[PDB]
């Protein structure tokens, strides 16, 4: 959504050669017509084939659409696809390349001089063949995430046309990333991690797919649940809310040490060393594309984690997650089975949800979060 | 910032003929090179000539940059101006016209059939000559306004290189437009309107230009002060703040009848009928471009206005404007004189402001308001 991504990996003996051919071809590309028609046809089919994705992929997709300032739907792209001609693409390519900014991570068995060399080879190739000039600092747009109002609940409902199963995703948006908000949310996810599998899947058989954990996008974060089931969504909702309350009660009732076990387990996971080159590359690249550049984040966050108490999580929960929390921000995506119509612990009363009819109106009527500050 | 604007006014006897020539030429324009070079050069100079504008024009301009999500500076435009060649423009024009949405207000001595006729003439001419197709509903971006944090004060400072006066603008952003917030702000502006001229100019002689009133942009609003002076900005700040306190005290102390006089006066001001065609057109166009479409807003708001009391305004002020207000949102633009360096009633102690070093960082680091619902 920001441009283009290129990654070359492997033995570096011949690596500058491959990279150089790619960039040369990138910047002077001439489209063969038969090939264009064929690949266009393939892309068209892949746009259509979305209706046959899994219910949970759908739920994630719609949540993505809902939460980003600007996001084009598969439908809009498909529709827009027919006005794509050979001339038009040929005209698009030089314009795309006329102004660029490049952010690169070069990591492995290479020297500083060789890195500078490679970088400068890329810059020079782009200048030579596409006449690229710099972009203005202010044109480096990042998109923000829709900021949900205190105490609101929104539902977005859609039908899966292929599968006779449902999917649900439930998102409790918390706030901007920072040391403490991150370890609170992560600790909570850690604590509820195994109880959720054992209750929601093994005992209650809510579905084959049952997932829970942190969601992070556009510098904001929160708690998400993804489930795929034969049972209808409103029931799934009620079971997740009941689970959440059982969980708060369980966190209140638990001893200091079980709590410290959760801390120690989250801690080892977070401080866990990359075991091969490309995993370390992945971590740093993650720090870079999000523009947070927090390369020492694991130690900071773990150090802070060890400081945390039962109290902290209890009040976090009371502020942000409980059904009557002063800052609850809940959005739910319901993907209905083709056919569905529109003992156990006690499910709490939920407010009347607001049903979202139109994404643009929904977005227009809400604030946007800041972007996260670098380091 | 949204595209292009066309207004044709006058006797309607021949108006569709002029209109048809304009749009047909719009959609089939062929650029003469000499003209391009000449006009480009003129534009370059006009971009440069901003440095010689008045200090208060500068202050308004920078506040505009600060408060809008997206805004290109005159400097950035100037820089970007050099990559404009004949080929690039020739290619740009058909592309600009390739996808459009048109919102029109036709108002005057014309029939519905004639309106549909004119609209359809425009559409067909554009289709014929520029191959225009419709824009997608989702591509109708409006820009939002930066939402300032509770209790903050930010200052942005710049120097005017030409004029040996300073200018300041102070903006107290309140919240989104709605009937009550609007009449609170408007009543307050109305009440403080003349005391401010008489105190800050006539008595204290802070400068020739002294202005106050509602600022409305991008569906958001607030209270603004604009001043141009020989006096240094920090002093202007302290004097405006002292004035605001004088005003609160004065509003507390005033009688029921004086209060109703202010109400009645705001009421008359708001209910003033446009006296000629183009003023009514301007009013409707204002209702349309903001996409609020509140055509009967004047009556709703005046009716509601008559209901308000001293108490309400005192607590509004206490909530949004006072120095220790829980929801103060203050931004200031300081334009220093070329030469300038970087009793009276009692000015309150003010906090240390946060100095904006770079507009983009400032914007990136704050939330954005919603757009107003239609």
PDB resolution in Å: 3.4
* The two structure tokens encoding residue B322: 């006072």
From the list B61, B82, B85, B86, the residue with the least C-alpha distance to B72 is B61
CB contact at 8 A, B168 and B229: yes
Describe the crossing of helices B256-271 and B297-305 by its angle, rounded to 10 degrees.
180
At which residue do the structure tokens 């109400």 appear? Answer: B263
Which residues on neighbouring strands pair with residue A221, listed in sequence order?
A175, A216
From the list A85, A82, A80, the residue with the least C-alpha distance to A31 is A85
Residues of chain B with Cβ-Cβ distance to A371 below 8 Å are 364-365
Side-chain-side CA neighbours of A15 within 13 Å: the count stands at 16
Taking the C-alpha atoms of residue A18 and residue A80, their distance in angstroms, rounded to an integer, is 34
Q: In B153-308, which residue ranges form alpha helices assigned H by DSSP?
A: 179-196, 233-253, 256-271, 277-289, 297-305
Taking the C-alpha atoms of residue A187 and residue A263, their distance in angstroms, rounded to an integer, is 7
The residue extents of the domains of chain A are 1-145, 146-375
**Which one of A91, A147, A365 has the shortest CB-CB distance to B367?**
A147
Nearest residue of B to residue A360, measured between CA atoms: B138
**Domain A146-375: assigned CATH number:** 3.30.830.10
What value, to the nearest 5°, has the Cα angle with vertex B45 and ends B40 and B46? Answer: 95
Q: Is the dihedral of CA B52, B56, B59, B64 positive or negative?
A: negative
Side-chain-side CA neighbours of B312 within 13 Å: the count stands at 15
Residues annotated within the binding site of A are: 272-278
CB contact at 8 A, A11 and A122: no
Side-chain-side CA neighbours of B181 within 13 Å: the count stands at 16
- Interchain proximity B136–A367, CB inside 8 Å: no
Taking the C-alpha atoms of residue B318 and residue B121, their distance in angstroms, rounded to an integer, is 55
Residues annotated within the binding site of A for ATP are: 272-278
From the list B289, B295, B321, the residue with the least C-alpha distance to B181 is B321
Taking the C-alpha atoms of residue A171 and residue A66, their distance in angstroms, rounded to an integer, is 11
Breaks (C-N over 2.5 A) in chain B follow: 342
| β pairing state of A152-159 and A133-134 | unpaired
* The two structure tokens encoding residue A308: 């945390």
Which residues on neighbouring strands pair with residue B225, listed in sequence order?
B170, B212
Q: How far apart are the first and last CA of chain A?
A: 23
**Which one of A133, A137, A367 has the shortest CB-CB distance to B360?**
A137
Taking the C-alpha atoms of residue B203 and residue B240, their distance in angstroms, rounded to an integer, is 13
Taking the C-alpha atoms of residue B234 and residue B242, their distance in angstroms, rounded to an integer, is 12
DSSP conformation class of A338: S
| β pairing state of A152-159 and A354-355 | parallel
Longest dimension (CA), chain A: 73
Phi-psi region of A143 (alpha: psi -120 to 50; beta: other; left: phi over 0): beta
DSSP conformation class of B111: -
Pairs of residues, one from chain A and one from chain B, whose beta carbons lie less than 8 Å apart: 46
Task: Say if B1-145 and B146-374 have the same CATH topology.
Answer: yes
DSSP conformation class of A68: B
Taking the C-alpha atoms of residue A44 and residue A75, their distance in angstroms, rounded to an integer, is 11
How far apart, in Å, are the Cα atoms of B230 and each of A85, B40, B167, B338? 62, 37, 9, 11
Which residues on neighbouring strands pair with residue A216, listed in sequence order?
A221
- Report the CATH architecture of B146-374: 2-Layer Sandwich (3.30)
- Strand, coil or helix: what is B13? coil
Residues of chain B with Cβ-Cβ distance to A178 below 8 Å are none
What value, to the nearest 5°, has the Cα angle with vertex B39 and ends B34 and B42? Answer: 130
Q: Could you confirm whether domain A1-145 is CATH 3.30.830.10? A: yes
CB contact at 8 A, B152 and B326: no
The edge-to-edge listing of strands for the beta sheet with A354-355 is A210-217, A220-229, A166-176, A329-336, A152-159, A354-355
- Strand, coil or helix: what is A9? coil
- Interchain proximity B369–A370, CB inside 8 Å: no
Experimental method: X-ray
Taking the C-alpha atoms of residue A220 and residue A369, their distance in angstroms, rounded to an integer, is 8
């Amino acid at each position: 959504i920001y441009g283009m991504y290129l990654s070359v990996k492997g033995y570096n003996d011949k690596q500058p050669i491959l990279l150089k051919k790619i960039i040369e071809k990138m910047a002077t590309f001439e489209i063969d017509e038969k090939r264009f028609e064929i690949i266009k046809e393939a892309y068209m089919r892949s746009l259509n084939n979305f209706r046959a994705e899994q219910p949970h992929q759908h739920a994630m997709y719609y949540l993505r659409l809902l939460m980003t300032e600007v996001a084009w739907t598969k439908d809009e792209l498909k529709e827009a696809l027919d006005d794509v001609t050979l001339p038009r693409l040929k005209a698009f390519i030089p314009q795309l390349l006329s102004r660029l900014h490049i952010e690169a991570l070069l990591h492995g068995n290479i020297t500083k001089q060789a890195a500078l060399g490679i970088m400068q080879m890329v810059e020079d190739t782009l200048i030579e063949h596409a006449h690229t000039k710099p972009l203005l600092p202010s044109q480096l747009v990042r998109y923000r995430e829709v900021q949900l109002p205190d105490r609101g609940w929104f539902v977005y409902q859609q039908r899966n046309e292929v599968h006779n199963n449902s999917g649900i995703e439930i998102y409790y948006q918390t706030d901007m990333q920072s040391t403490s908000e991150n370890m609170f949310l992560e600790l909570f996810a850690q604590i509820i991690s195994e109880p959720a599998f054992n209750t929601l899947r093994t005992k209650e058989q809510l579905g084959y797919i049952v997932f829970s954990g942190p969601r992070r996008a556009n510098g904001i974060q929160g708690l998400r649940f993804i489930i795929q089931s034969e049972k209808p969504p409103h029931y799934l909702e009620s079971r997740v809310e009941a689970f959440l309350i059982t969980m708060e009660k369980s966190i209140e009732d638990m001893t200091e040490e079980a709590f410290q076990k959760h801390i120690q387990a989250l801690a080892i996971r977070r401080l866990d060393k990359p075991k091969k080159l490309s995993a370390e590359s992945a971590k740093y690249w993650g720090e870079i594309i999000s523009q947070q550049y927090n390369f020492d984040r694991d130690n900071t966050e773990v150090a802070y984690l060890k400081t945390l108490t039962k109290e902290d999580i209890i009040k976090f929960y009371k502020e942000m997650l409980a059904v009557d929390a002063p800052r609850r921000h809940k959005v739910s995506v319901h993907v209905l089975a083709r056919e569905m119509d529109s003992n156990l612990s006690q499910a709490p009363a939920l407010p009347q949800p607001e049903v979202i009819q139109n994404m643009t109106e929904f977005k227009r009527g809400l604030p946007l979060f800041p972007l996260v500050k670098p380091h």
